[PDB]
Design a protein around this ligand. Structure first.
Ligand code: CLA
Ligand code: CLA
Ligand code: CLA
Ligand code: CLA
Ligand code: CLA
Ligand code: CLA
Ligand code: CLA
Ligand code: CLA
Ligand code: CLA
Ligand code: LHG
Lengths: 146, 75, 40, 80, 40, 741, 143, 139
């Protein structure tokens, strides 16, 4: 919230169009449309079916963050017992497969613990959050003014 | 080019009557329970059939007759 | 993949080692150490 | 393995013993409650930490607690 | 009947009846006096 | 003289139990002590199996509740007809179907929502409706509002009839269990007396009513001059002049000279050029043939005269070498457990609903349905979501049966036992195929994304690069295009122009055109395969491992719906079948979202559009699907950001109600994350502090407040999540489709 | 014709005798593989395995690699195959180093530290040989 | 040694694994009055022989779940089941019941273990025993 407010206000200040922010920041649809939808036009066009420009890496990292953020949800929502049983099945499959029993694990594979799962999900979530916002901010400001 | 069907003729009646007779003959050798339910007034002329067996084999006869008549009329 | 900076050949050899050689080396060393059943 | 400890508020209701699925708990004569029996944990090396014994205890808070410690094959409930 | 009276007095019926009454009051007042941003 | 066996007045009709909530459950009967008693009350209500152990009583309750749901559906249908009769422009739309938007909801102007009453054409202001009721009514021979009003009144009367039927058949005369178990007679009656008879009646309606009215309507006759439907019956010459074969009466029927009726019982195929829908003669012969087939099929099972196969004999006779006892023992399972029947019926009905959604769009039955893109999109997405939910419910109630009604004594070495005995191989091979599909499908998208981002479009998986052509789908399309020629000689045109052929266009818009498949279609179809196999993996693991597992060997003793087994064994969160259903709901949502997104974008890009008088076709999005849908960035930019303009810029217009709802969808989703990401201990402690606060002022409640249970927390999270996401997609699709002409 | 039963006649073992898991053809074909063949030294086993597992690795880079439409297509495929074989040899050596630090028995000569070392060396040599012979077959002229 | 005929079972993929032949397994023996069918803790149903029956499992929890099923799911109650631990070396260790009397009932001769002489509220604060290798409950 803090960074969205700062960035939109300063975009208006730098472009000289303070009127846009002043009019549209009093309702949430203006935040959705005049800030997110509007300033993503150049970011998502970093690489195009027609070519590639210097914002390509920022678009790729934007998608990368949108992916890692979602990946965190898998640890945050699904919990241990399901994956433990699935790992049981995979262990049986490996132990019963010919030409693969010659190789055996040194450590019995188990599902990640509850606290470890929470930490890993939070880590993926935070990394995706930071990368997505950094990519969007840098791309939008560089395209507008950079 | 609609498939050709036949107006009613004695040949059609004879064909499906033969179908009815063969359906009855086939049913007598295949139906597991033939004398259960409401019976005929005199089963001797029906080969030990009930009402359900007679109705089923007659309906099967009309069905086979319709199929055969339409197939023959097509060609 | 050329650059105009001084000693442009360095990333040609440094990046692979940081990319392949060093990662694999420490990967194997740590894997051996963590499964080392010599002591506890 | 985990540590199962039983305190002096136990009333010998045997609920913890019956709820144990891995047969860790037992009953031993006592003199601090009406039932003259108290729970005991002589086979803690088999406990997994399912907390069913804690779930079954009727006293205020718990006269029985399970502290999860070092994880072994038996404690982790591994069949492979 | 007694049972009907008791059922009508259960929590969901009461809360929804009060909500309907309040909603009707507000909607009627805004029908007759809309756009009331402040006491003039 | 019948198998009927009922009990008279088993349950007296009294109001006392109304005033005692939770009467059914012994746990909730004594009264509430905590707030949980409330949440349990609304949750265990319609679970009749747990309330009583009598199969007969459970079956009677099920029968009555089914009567109740029928009454509710009847009320809904009658309400739809009434609101289309009084508050709709159907009479105005009928005169000018190609210039007036259907509308049946009108908004009171109270706080400015009168702006929602946008102009739908013809001087009428109201909400445009996409449910497609207008096209159904026109295809049903409706011309006057009084007929719709009469239909609504009849629907209300029938709803009252069903309510009284439920009351009588439960509180007064309740059938015995043996009556419920006459599965052979039940199938006979429902296959012949319900499906066959209903289809025959509808065919009679279509032939005697719908054909003359629609023939006049498509010929340019004004709606006010078309004779009332009973005039054709009362004056058969009017029917005969429309169709000459009607002058021959019913003689050709009983003489098997059926070709006489060829003029109004055709095999045309294709679509009606005037309206864009299917030919009504095709549907008439179709429903007549369906009726004949179902009436024939309804006589299969022997009921009371010893003629017909017995289901138990058929089940016990099909057994082979690999299966041992084979299908033996299933008849007793399916005649004593309602949950198995519920699972099978739910799975089949969900698949049937998906089939309905998939088959309607390619060949629109109703007139002008194809020309209304919004109606097509709405109907497809709606019935697809319904089907997905039903399939998930099948996966749930099957596990419920396995936990509760499975008895190992009567299932020795049958098919179910060998399910439970090689389940590990099933789950392992299924897990492998899911992982392989995920890799070799989604990694294709990621590889394309990286190649495009690196300025290497020649290394992509595209039609101008490495190509993944769906050769089998193209071949079957080519085969179905050639079907009218020789494979189905008596067919005038193809079943649907989606396979290929000419471009059927109504007015200035495309009704249906060939749908080519390229690399993008291959990738998306295999993505669908991956998602479906994963959802099947989750639900099948839930069903198979419901009884027990290696981790927990006595899971069935805990029940179907339990949160966990404790932090022991390393952590046993979400091991019940209920948690497997809760996990599969998300994956069903993801799969159906991808399905509807693919349908919408492909239809907009390569099918829909406009036709110029020169004959050229300009699609809605200029055919960007084949080049953009191969990268995730393409989906983000050319589909979501591009097509979300029509919904984000909806403020100040009649479409604003969508935009609001759009934002609403984006909210509840986020809200749901505060239930799925957290646990109940923190909330319990916070409630403890708040209870201290309310206690300080001596205002603490008598009903002790408690945080939601783990199962309830998961349920609330998934429910609000699905609500938010589905509402978002609905608002987006409606605002997009109501703005593309 | 109950062709499906327990594995090795032991119902309590988590496996079943199936037409592909315990059939005579299955056992005959599996037991004759280089890994499971009788009386073979670990070095020869590794050589034989590496032959095939390096021969078949020439394909994917040759037909799909970045140089697939260039004069250097087969060379690129060969280089990729050689690098992958080197990585595989390193993985095998590490597995042998970390797996057999306990007892050194003789029940299986492959399941021993020295046996696995010989197996890995033979695998490396066989992989090089297979990749090179595959390149020689595939490459046109350049000799 | 252990004596008993294995129950009539077709086998399953949920049975033993390499742990039984590498680490340990468990065995359960019981005398059934009459031949009948019981649910395998590993999945499926198995017919158990009349007389003495012997069964191998992978975990003690599975054996005790089977014992509970035997004790609670048959009208002739099976009370004589014994559970042993089987080591790969061949040594058999008898586990359940410990002294021939079920732990649910009090039997003279058992020694109290793990019993504390204080309430749970009288445990010492962590700060008083920090940098030691102990825990508040352990002291
Ligand atoms: C000697 C007598 C006789 C003769 C000459 C014919 C001749 C004919 N019949 Mg026919 N028929 C007969 C007896 C006869 N029938 C009887 C006794 C019956 C009653 C059972 C029928 C019932 C019957 C029907 C119901 C139909 C015909 C049709 C036809 C015509 C086309 C059939 C064909 O090959 O095209 C079709 C060739 C194909 C290769 C199509 C087969 C592919 C189908 C669609 C697959 C269906 C799979 C299905 C779902 C699986 C069943 C599921 C379950 C039961 C296991 C042909 C002129 C058809 C017709 O009217 O043609 C215009 C037609 O629909 N007949
Ligand atoms: C975007 C978020 C996301 C992603 C990527 C996944 C990914 C996965 N989930 Mg999942 N899940 C999620 C969210 C997500 N989930 C959420 C929110 C929930 C809550 C309902 C679940 C619930 C759930 C269940 C219940 C199940 C899964 C399963 C799976 C797996 C399916 C197999 C597969 O996709 O092929 C493999 C994986 C992928 C294709 C993912 C992309 C991997 C990339 C393309 C490869 C990277 C290239 C290379 C390795 C990079 C090298 C660099 C080096 C440093 C590593 C997979 C690991 C199922 C499973 O266990 O597998 C069958 C399963 O049963 N998930
Ligand atoms: C004109 C009417 C008529 C007549 C004279 C007969 C005469 C005969 N039928 Mg018969 N039958 C008839 C109508 C008739 N059937 C009809 C309408 C049906 C169908 C319901 C049958 C079904 C039928 C069966 C199933 C059998 C006979 C049999 C017989 C023969 C011995 C039974 C008997 O009464 O003597 C006899 C030649 C029996 C026969 O031929 O012996 C093997 C026999 O099994 N009939
Ligand atoms: C932490 C500081 C830092 C960082 C992030 C980088 C980052 C980079 N350097 Mg670099 N460099 C640094 C300090 C750093 N440099 C210093 C101090 C020197 C002087 C010795 C150099 C000399 C140098 C050369 C000569 C080259 C690079 C190159 C590169 C690029 C290739 C990746 C790489 O480092 O491997 C290759 C580079 C090295 C291995 C240099 C050694 C790294 C320094 C000396 C030690 C840093 C240790 C670090 C603090 C460890 C943190 C631990 C943490 C992970 C827990 C990359 C952009 C290459 C390049 O420009 O490619 C385009 C290249 O050719 N660097
Ligand atoms: C000032 C004069 C006035 C007028 C002309 C109307 C006229 C109307 N009101 Mg109304 N109303 C008024 C005052 C008035 N009301 C006041 C002061 C209140 C506050 C209690 C309400 C609360 C109210 C509700 C809650 C509802 C109406 C409804 C209606 C409409 C249905 C007919 C009706 O009243 O029966 C129905 C009246 C009631 C159910 C409650 C009336 C309460 C009485 C007047 C006190 C009708 C157009 C109904 C409607 O439009 O249906 C959707 C409706 O739901 N009104
Ligand atoms: C011709 C006979 C016939 C027909 C049409 C039906 C029809 C139906 N049965 Mg059914 N049933 C029958 C015989 C029949 N049954 C017999 C003989 C038995 C005993 C073995 C049962 C036992 C049975 C059970 C146990 C259950 C049903 C249920 C149902 C309903 C399922 C819901 C549905 O299909 O939605 C479609 C809905 C409709 C088409 C609405 C129809 C509304 C009324 C009831 C239809 C009356 C039509 C009637 C023939 C007169 C109209 C003819 C003319 C005047 C136009 C459906 C209405 C389920 C239920 O509870 O529903 C009540 C259920 O659980 N049936
Ligand atoms: C339940 C279905 C149903 C019903 C109630 C009717 C009812 C009727 N049809 Mg009809 N019909 C139907 C299905 C039906 N049809 C179908 C499926 C076909 C296609 C084969 C026809 C073909 C048909 C013809 C060709 C004629 C009728 C006629 C009639 C009328 C006089 C026949 C009669 O009742 O005595 C028996 C009557 C209103 C006759 C009429 O004059 O009606 C206008 C007439 O000539 N029908
Ligand atoms: C014909 C359909 C059908 C039928 C008859 C049943 C019947 C039953 N189900 Mg089942 N189920 C179905 C479909 C069906 N289900 C589907 C499609 C799913 C997948 C989602 C499930 C998932 C499911 C689970 C997970 C469980 C049941 C249970 C039950 C049993 C009763 C307990 C219950 O749910 O009542 C109580 C009902 C409720 C509390 C529902 C009220 C809350 C809902 C979710 C709100 C819905 C919001 C709505 C869609 C939108 C509103 C928006 C708002 C802003 C206004 C009963 C045997 C339970 C059981 O085990 O009993 C044996 C159980 O745990 N079912
Ligand atoms: C991504 C997958 C992939 C790709 C692109 C290739 C690509 C190739 N393989 Mg190949 N292969 C693969 C997977 C793959 N393989 C797998 C999984 C196996 C099983 C382990 C094999 C086993 C295999 C054999 C056994 C042979 C090939 C050969 C070839 C080459 C010629 C094609 C052929 O059949 O020769 C047809 C035969 C000729 C052209 C005669 C050449 C003399 C070609 C470069 C052939 C080759 O390179 O030989 C020189 C060959 O003999 N492959
Ligand atoms: C067509 C499009 C491309 C699809 C190609 C994929 C084909 C791959 C597998 C071949 C199908 C074999 C079916 C034979 C199977 C069959 O004939 O069963 C026959 C056999 C039962 O034979 P009996 O004569 O004993 O049967 C008595 C019966 O009356 C039932 O009791 O069933 C089994 O052996 C079950 C084991 C199947 C275990 C393998 C299951 C495979 C699951 C994956 C299926 C993959 C294809 C899915 C796509 C639909």
């Amino acid at each position: 919230w803090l960074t969205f407010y700062w960035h939109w206000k300063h975009l208006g200040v730098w472009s000289g169009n303070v009127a846009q922010f002043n009019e549209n920041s009093t309702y949430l649809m203006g935040w959705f449309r005049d800030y997110l939808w509007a300033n993503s036009a150049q970011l998502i066009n970093g690489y195009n079916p027609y070519g590639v420009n210097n914002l390509s890496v920022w678009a790729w990292m934007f998608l990368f963050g949108h992916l890692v953020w979602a990946t965190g949800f898998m640890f945050l929502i699904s919990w241990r017992g399901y994956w433990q049983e699935l790992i049981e099945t995979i262990v049986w499959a490996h132990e019963r497969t010919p030409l693969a029993n010659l190789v055996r694990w040194k450590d019995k594979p188990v599902a990640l613990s509850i606290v470890q799962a929470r930490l890993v999900g939070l880590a993926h979530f935070t990394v995706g959050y930071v990368l997505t916002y950094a990519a969007f901010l840098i791309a939008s400001t560089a395209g507008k003014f950079g | 080019a609609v498939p050709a069907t036949l107006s009613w003729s004695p040949k059609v009646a004879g064909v499906m009557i033969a179908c009815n007779i063969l359906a009855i003959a086939f049913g007598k050798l295949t139906i597991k329970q033939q004398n259960v339910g409401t019976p005929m007034p005199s089963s001797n002329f029906f080969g030990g059939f009930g009402l359900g067996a007679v109705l089923g084999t007659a309906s099967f006869g009309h069905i086979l007759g319709a199929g055969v008549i339409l197939g023959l009329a097509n060609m | 993949m050329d650059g105009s900076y001084a000693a442009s050949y360095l990333p040609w050899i440094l990046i692979p080692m940081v990319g392949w050689l060093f990662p694999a080396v420490t990967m194997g060393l740590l894997f051996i150490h963590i499964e080392s059943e010599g002591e506890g | 393995s985990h540590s199962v400890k039983i305190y002096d508020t136990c009333i010998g209701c045997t609920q913890c013993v019956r709820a144990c699925p891995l047969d860790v708990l037992e009953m031993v004569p006592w003199d601090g409650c009406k039932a003259a029996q108290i729970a005991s944990s002589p086979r803690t090396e088999d406990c997994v930490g399912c907390k069913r014994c804690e779930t079954a205890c009727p006293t205020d808070f718990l006269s029985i607690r399970v502290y999860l410690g070092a994880e072994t094959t038996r404690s982790m409930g591994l069949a492979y | 009947m007694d049972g009907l009276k008791s059922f009508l007095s259960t929590a969901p019926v009461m809360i929804m009846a009060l909500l309907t009454f309040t909603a009707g009051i507000l909607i009627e007042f805004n029908r007759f006096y809309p756009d009331l941003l402040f006491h003039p | 003289k019948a198998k009927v066996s009922v009990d008279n007045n088993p349950v007296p009709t009294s109001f006392e139990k109304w005033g005692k909530p939770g009467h059914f459950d012994r746990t909730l009967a004594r009264g509430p002590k905590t707030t949980t008693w409330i949440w349990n009350l609304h949750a265990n209500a319609h679970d009749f199996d747990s309330q009583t152990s009598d199969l007969e009583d459970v079956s009677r309750k099920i029968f009555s509740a089914h009567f109740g749901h029928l009454a509710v559906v009847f009320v809904w249908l009658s309400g739809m007809y009434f609101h289309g009769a009084k508050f709709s422009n159907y009479e105005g739309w009928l005169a000018d179907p190609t210039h007036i938007k259907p509308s049946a909801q009108v908004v009171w102007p109270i706080v400015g929502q009168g702006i929602l009453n946008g102009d739908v054409g013809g001087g009428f202001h109201g909400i445009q409706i996409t449910s497609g009721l207008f096209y159904l009514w026109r295809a049903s021979g409706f011309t006057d509002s009084y007929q719709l009003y009469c239909t609504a009144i009849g629907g209300l009367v029938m709803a009252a009839l069903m309510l009284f039927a439920g009351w009588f058949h439960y509180h007064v005369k309740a059938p015995k269990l043996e009556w419920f178990q006459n599965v052979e007679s039940m199938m006979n009656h429902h296959l012949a007396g319900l499906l066959g008879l209903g289809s025959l009646g509808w065919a009679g309606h279509q032939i005697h009513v719908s054909m003359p009215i629609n023939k006049l309507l498509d010929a340019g006759v004004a709606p006010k001059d078309i004779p009332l439907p009973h005039e054709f019956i009362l004056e058969p010459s009017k029917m005969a002049e429309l169709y000459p074969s009607f002058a021959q009466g019913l003689t050709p029927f009983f003489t098997l000279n059926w070709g006489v009726y060829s003029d109004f019982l055709t095999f045309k195929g294709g679509l009606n050029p005037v309206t864009g829908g299917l030919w009504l003669s095709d549907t008439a012969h179709h429903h007549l043939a369906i009726a004949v087939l179902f009436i024939i099929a309804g006589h299969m099972y022997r009921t009371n005269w010893g003629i017909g196969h017995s289901m138990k004999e058929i089940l016990e006779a099909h057994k082979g070498p690999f299966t041992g006892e084979g299908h033996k023992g299933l008849y007793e399972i399916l005649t004593t457990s309602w949950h198995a029947q519920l699972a099978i019926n739910l799975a089949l009905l969900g698949s049937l609903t998906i089939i309905v959604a998939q088959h309607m769009y390619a060949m629109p039955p109703y007139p002008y349905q194809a020309i209304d893109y919004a109606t097509q999109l709405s109907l497809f997405t709606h019935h697809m979501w319904i089907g997905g939910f039903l399939i998930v419910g099948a996966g749930a109630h099957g596990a419920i049966f396995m936990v509760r009604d499975y008895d190992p004594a009567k299932n020795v070495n049958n098919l179910l036992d060998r399910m439970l005995r090689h389940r590990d191989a099933i789950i392992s091979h299924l897990n492998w195929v899911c992982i392989f599909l995920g890799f070799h499908s989604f990694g294709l998208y990621i590889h394309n994304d990286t190649m495009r981002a690196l300025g290497r479009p020649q290394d992509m998986f595209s039609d101008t690069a490495i190509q993944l052509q769906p050769i089998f789908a193209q071949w079957v399309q080519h085969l179905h295009t050639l079907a009218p020629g020789a494979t189905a000689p008596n067919a005038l045109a193809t079943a649907s122009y989606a396979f290929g052929g000419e471009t059927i266009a109504v007015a200035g818009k495309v009704a249906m055109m060939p749908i080519t498949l390229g690399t993008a279609d291959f990738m998306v179809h295999h993505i669908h395969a991956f998602t479906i196999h994963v959802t099947a993996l989750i639900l099948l693991k839930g069903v198979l491992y419901a009884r027990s597992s290696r981790l927990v060997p006595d899971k069935a003793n805990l029940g179907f719906r339990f949160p966990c087994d404790g932090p022991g064994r390393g952590g046993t969160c979400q091991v019940s079948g209920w948690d497997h259903v809760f996990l599969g709901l998300f994956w069903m949502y993801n799969s159906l979202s991808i399905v509807i997104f693919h349908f919408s974008w492909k239809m907009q890009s390569d099918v829909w559009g406009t036709v110029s008088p020169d004959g050229s076709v300009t699609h809605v999005t200029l055919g960007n699907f084949a080049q953009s849908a191969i990268t995730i960035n393409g989906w983000l930019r050319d589909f979501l950001w591009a097509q979300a303009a029509n919904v984000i810029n909806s403020y100040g217009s009649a479409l604003s109600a969508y935009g609001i709802m759009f934002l609403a969808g984006h909210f509840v989703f986020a809200f749901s994350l505060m239930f799925l990401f957290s646990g109940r201990g923190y909330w319990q402690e916070l409630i403890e502090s708040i209870v201290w606060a309310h206690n300080k002022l001596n205002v603490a409640p008598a009903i002790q407040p408690r945080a939601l249970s783990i199962i309830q927390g998961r349920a609330v999270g998934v429910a609000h999540y699905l609500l938010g996401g589905i509402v978002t997609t609905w608002a987006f699709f409606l605002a997009r489709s109501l703005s593309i002409g | 014709n109950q062709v499906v039963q327990a594995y090795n006649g032991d119902p309590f073992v988590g496996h079943l005798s199936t037409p592909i898991s315990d059939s005579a053809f299955t056992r005959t074909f599996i037991g004759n593989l280089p890994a499971y063949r009788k009386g073979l030294s670990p070095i020869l086993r590794g050589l034989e395995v590496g032959m095939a597992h390096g021969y078949f690795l020439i394909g994917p880079w040759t037909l799909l690699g970045p140089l697939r439409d260039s004069e250097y297509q087969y060379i690129g495929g060969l280089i990729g195959a050689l690098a992958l074989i080197l990585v595989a040899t390193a993985a095998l050596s590490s597995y042998g180093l970390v797996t057999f630090q306990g007892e050194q028995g003789s029940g299986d000569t492959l399941q021993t530290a020295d046996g696995w070392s010989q197996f890995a060396a033979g695998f490396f040599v066989g992989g090089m040989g297979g990749a090179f012979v595959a390149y020689f077959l595939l490459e046109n002229l350049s000799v | 040694e252990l004596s008993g005929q294995p129950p009539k079972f077709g086998g399953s993929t949920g049975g033993l694994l390499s742990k039984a032949n590498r680490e340990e397994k468990y065995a359960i023996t019981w005398t059934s009055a009459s031949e009948q069918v019981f649910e395998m803790p590993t999945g499926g149903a198995a017919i158990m022989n009349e007389g003495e029956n012997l069964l191998y499992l992978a975990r003690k929890e599975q054996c005790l779940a089977l014992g509970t099923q035997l004790r609670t799911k048959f009208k002739p109650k099976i009370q004589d089941y014994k559970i042993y631990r089987v080591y790969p070396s061949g040594e058999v260790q008898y586990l359940h019941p410990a002294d021939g009397v079920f732990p649910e009932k009090v039997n003279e001769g058992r020694e109290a273990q793990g019993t504390k002489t204080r309430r749970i509220g009288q445990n010492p604060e962590p700060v008083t025993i920090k940098f030691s290798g102990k825990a508040p409950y352990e002291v």
